[PDB]
Symmetry: D2
Subunit: 392 residues, 4 copies
């Protein structure tokens, strides 16, 4: 049998979007209230509170009404002034991408770049900060999703703070899937969203903003105001007694409310543990069947996405097409420089369950063997199962 | 009895958000596909196709992934450059507000302004264009929602086309509720969304873009690129064979898909008819009970919102609070310069049914009489019912 | 304009089914678990607990997996033995109907019957019990829905208990809409369901069973066992550690779980108050516009349904057809003997809000006037509004 | 990690209930119409029409408003009278169970019984009918779910028709998952429902009734009338111009409407193919890892459920508990005489996709090996995958 391209798949095991939690799907269908209805004003405030709790934040996170690219662009536009000296850290497509936004707002850009299967060395950051005491802003990506690798943002954040500089963190594809919070890495702007590990669709940004970041932005006359890019205009919008700069995405708020409930109710530590275990099983299976994990070392592989290096001679696009057509299972391609070079299996929110690693490994192996590889699929499944069983 | 502020209301009869069509609420809970899944790529293309059909467009409308303030800001930022001389037409909050964005992108701003219960006079537009050959861009709001009034955008658009200028039209709260289309008014940029008459929640922008506008925006070094504010980045994203500049709001697209099906299946003309009838009945009831329609004339009153002038001396905020607390019915305040001057009752999508005008009249009259007015509520209901019963 | 018969209506204001609460609609879409999954076994037990709390029951209510006709037939089949002497009380279609089931299970049937707009006199019950000391079972209907009238079941229950007889109560269309509980009327079998005032669809029965009723049924070898009609087989099915006699209606259980939450969370007393107020406003409006409430006295009119007598010369079916076609509002016909003689407007769960009485009165008046009546519709609305305002 | 019993599982792979199709879950949340609303009357008629098309029926199927045990009990109660001599065919729990209801309605019962891993032999049926001209009714179960085995009902039905007897067929867990229709087996009563292969929750019965069966039931003084158990009461209820004996399960009808659309739109043959492939892959994997399929032969194994024999010495209850606790995968126990003897993995509707066989095999193998077995799980997965990859 074959699954047609036009028809829905059986299991979406991508690095996001994945299907939302079923409760979130129902939540998206909640009553759409007028945004100035008192019941909505209360709800919105409560949602900010839940987000604050989930992010372990000492102050209120800002919700912005676009998917997280909005938060990242807004952070650059607001926190980077023309006299700032920015150090951008690039270990993949998103990290490198951010430097282009930094250069938009300040002509002074320094960069540390590593190969797109490696991680930034905190010591290299320290060496750079010593060489360049003029640095005032540092930007880093936690999980550079198209690479499935993780940067040590807490160690990096400690060094940025030691140098009196501001830290911008992209944690879009890590928050909620592993231990990470604005406080942990001493972030001044910490950008995430509910559309990766939290199991909601794309549409909203969740942003931690330090009191020092608030001061800097509010004193910056170039920071966007009366603009979709404005962070400062949303400063007090959490309050039931305050207006919204523009109309909030009411249904997305309903979805986020449920996503936060699910996360908080399950227990963040338990949620992180199942992401890590699913990924660990996946990597063990990949290696056992004769494939290679993309990450330069196991230690930097993401607990929320496994990137698998495309073997020589294998057409990666055809591979994904075959996994879907044969088994109904959808994986992600790479992006930019990693496009065509790897395949990504997400382990995110609803898909962060070890049984999904088993399904993924089988479909990946099956498609690889259809492409003429001679993988030991059974061996891969047993290796993955051994990881699950050893944690039991 | 009293309805608590924290509890949900019984009927939301605002000028938006209103509760979405029940089908749309269910639609929002459809499968969230990976955005590069072939089934989603096809779905997105077919949603753009539906929007093109709904908008009677000769070319593809652009969907932007924020609520229509994004469309309006992006249009200013992309189409208006400092060489342009902008004529902004202002008869209300949104019309005047657009001038602020125009001035951000060009120092040259001329305006025709009328009080916020009037419509722009096409003779004044013709005269202004004649006196100012230097005008290159003209902006106008179709339904300036906080006033419940309509501008004659088709005649205005023809004058603008004859002059040789670009036209930017805000049809956020008119499209889908009355006859209007980019073609009808020779729009170069026509901004709307599904969150007023189309009965979806806030989150997306539907934008008609003329071939001439495309060329102007793509030529302009100052037009946003690699930005939330970019229209040009999204030119080819409708196509199943093309990537997305950033991740689309997948669940909002599911909602839009349903909203467009409802509209096209019902028949746009039939849909416009019931908006207009609901509004006509509303206005008749308002006048018969002893209140005044805000619009300077009945002829410019919107078929998608009835704005009712607050009797001098009545506390409009307390009035709305009373309507919700006594009867569970939610109305909109004014906004900006109409705040405190009037109350708005929306007739939009799911609320554009004449029986809702009856409910609105009773709650409005009841709240007014609680504030010491002596309205003839029965007379109001009978006048509204006569309109319904007379409809041919 | 006209609403086609094939298309959905705007507002369903019948005596049930009405549209479910929106939360219940979402709840019906919850995960369908295996009935022997431990999470479902726990859920089912919790649902019984919630039902017990809502019914103010000293012991567990039984949920049966058919709409309440099942409970009523099962009660007759189980509690009525061939040597029982049954007194059936009939003030309408359902009360009279029950006597046919009683006669199925015992040849000994006595009856008190009153006209179908009147109520049973507790004194007549007392007189009958004195005349016939051999009576062992008495059956009564609380709200005989096709009549929109209420029997004094607590007073009647006290007299039945005084005579040592068992009491079967049909509270299908009263429970949750007014103060009534098995304990209040000393019921031995108390049959209701969530498909009237509780705002869920039809499918489930909620049955209070006294310990004395349990003893009687279990000792009755003719009581249905291994049967859809079995109550006794479900005795222990509430327990997470016990099996289900047959497969429960899992999705209906999900709906009931939400319905109970809504009721308990709002506060039963507050729920009853809004049913009573909506009905009170409705009756005041009916009378003021020149129509007649069917009930012989206002005191016996149901707080959950208003039955309106059809004027001479008016085609009641055509009337309902016109209310729907003209205004999109759906009312109930009568049933059996009341069919063609009255129209019913329900005030049940989601429709038990006074603003719906206003909509109902307008559509009823409008349709009556279309039929050549000359009703004072405005006067009716004002009378209804006066009732609402006097409770404020 | 461990999945708590109180928390939801990851994948329900039981022989039903399984989670409903996502479209059905949404369908259950459709508007609940008044049952006498013309739009519902039409909808109900069109749902019966869809069921008739799905069942390839020459006449209208009857929908009864309880899960299919209602259909089976009602069929016994209506079709079997004490003059009848019933031949009950028993190869499992449901087959044997039906004999109990037969005996309730006629004292004359003959039976052909085989052990609960076998199928009824059509030669034995022919011989029995020959030896017993007095047989007037024959009952058979198509898929006796607690055994995962299939009886040859088409050949059996032809023998029964030749004999001149009525045939009652239980196709609850076969219809929609393999080729079978009332016509195919000359059924006089054919009982099924949407809660197994059709991917809806429990609550409705779909019943094929022959013209001959109608005449027999309507003649029988003992057939239930004015009863939950009545088939005869429902004969004309499909028609938009006819009343309902009691209130239909409106939300279940919405669910059924969607389930039938899914089935008819996909193509019944295509649907049967994927059930059969999923099952075939499952059986291959079970055997290759070292376990035994319960069915006496592969040829009688159901394409909608794989029953796996418990290795002697293994605690089957603890096994299922382990599969859920370790892997979040839910399997069915046996029932009655198969309880403790085997574990069942359903392949039904939404779970009838081959990738689910892979997940089931891994969780089953993992749980078995945790109980001290030494299964070749990798080998099992590879054998299952080979079946998938071989499918022409
Ligand atoms: C690492 C990362 N950053 C930012 C974004 C923008 O939302 C994405 C989404 N691909 C992402 O994966
Ligand atoms: C006329 C108008 N324009 C733009 C917007 C921004 O979405 C709104 C919404 N108030 C509006 O009513
Ligand atoms: C009073 C009454 N009793 C019993 C039933 C059976 O559910 C109904 C539903 N019409 C009813 O209204
Ligand atoms: C074969 C069979 N018959 C009847 C029923 C009653 O619905 C079931 C459900 N276990 C079944 O599996």
């Amino acid at each position: 049998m074959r699954y047609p391209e036009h028809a829905d798949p059986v299991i979406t095991l991508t690095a996001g979007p994945v299907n939302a939690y079923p409760e979130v799907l129902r939540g998206l269908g909640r009553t759409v209230l007028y945004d100035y209805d008192p019941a909505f004003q209360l709800l919105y405030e409560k949602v900010v509170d839940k987000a604050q709790k989930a992010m372990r934040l000492s102050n209120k996170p800002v919700i912005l009404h676009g998917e997280p690219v909005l938060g990242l662009e807004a952070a650059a536009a607001s926190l980077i002034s023309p006299d700032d000296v920015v150090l951008n850290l690039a270990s993949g497509v998103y990290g490198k991408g951010f430097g282009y936004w930094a250069k938009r707002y300040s002509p002074h850009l320094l960069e540390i770049e590593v190969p797109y299967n490696e991680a930034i060395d905190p010591q290299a950051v320290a060496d750079m900060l010593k060489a360049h005491p003029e640095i005032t802003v540092v930007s880093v990506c936690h999980h550079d999703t198209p690479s499935g690798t993780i940067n040590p943002i807490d160690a990096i954040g400690a060094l940025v703070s030691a140098h009196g500089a501001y830290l911008i963190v992209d944690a879009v594809s890590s928050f909620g899937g592993m231990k990470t919070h604005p406080e942990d890495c001493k972030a001044d702007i910490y950008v995430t969203g509910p559309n990766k590990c939290l199991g909601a669709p794309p549409g909203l940004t969740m942003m931690g903003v330090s009191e020092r970041a608030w001061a800097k932005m509010k004193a910056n006359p170039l920071a966007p105001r009366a603009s979709m890019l404005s962070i400062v205009d949303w400063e007090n919008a959490w309050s039931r007694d305050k207006p919204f700069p523009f109309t909030p995405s009411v249904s997305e708020i309903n979805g986020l409310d449920v996503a936060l409930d699910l996360y908080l109710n399950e227990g963040p530590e338990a949620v992180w543990a199942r992401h890590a275990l699913t990924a660990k099983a996946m990597r063990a299976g990949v290696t056992a069947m004769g494939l290679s994990v993309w990450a330069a070392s196991d230690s930097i592989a993401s607990p929320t996405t496994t990137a698998v290096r495309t073997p020589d001679g294998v057409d990666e696009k055809a591979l994904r097409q075959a996994a879907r057509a044969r088994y109904g299972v959808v994986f992600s391609s790479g992006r930019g420089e990693t496009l065509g070079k790897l395949t990504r299996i997400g382990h995110m929110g609803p898909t962060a369950q070890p049984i999904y690693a088993i399904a993924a490994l089988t479909a990946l192996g099956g498609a690889m063997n259809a492409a003429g590889r001679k993988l030991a699929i059974g061996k891969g499944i047993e290796a993955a199962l051994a990881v699950i069983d050893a944690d039991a």
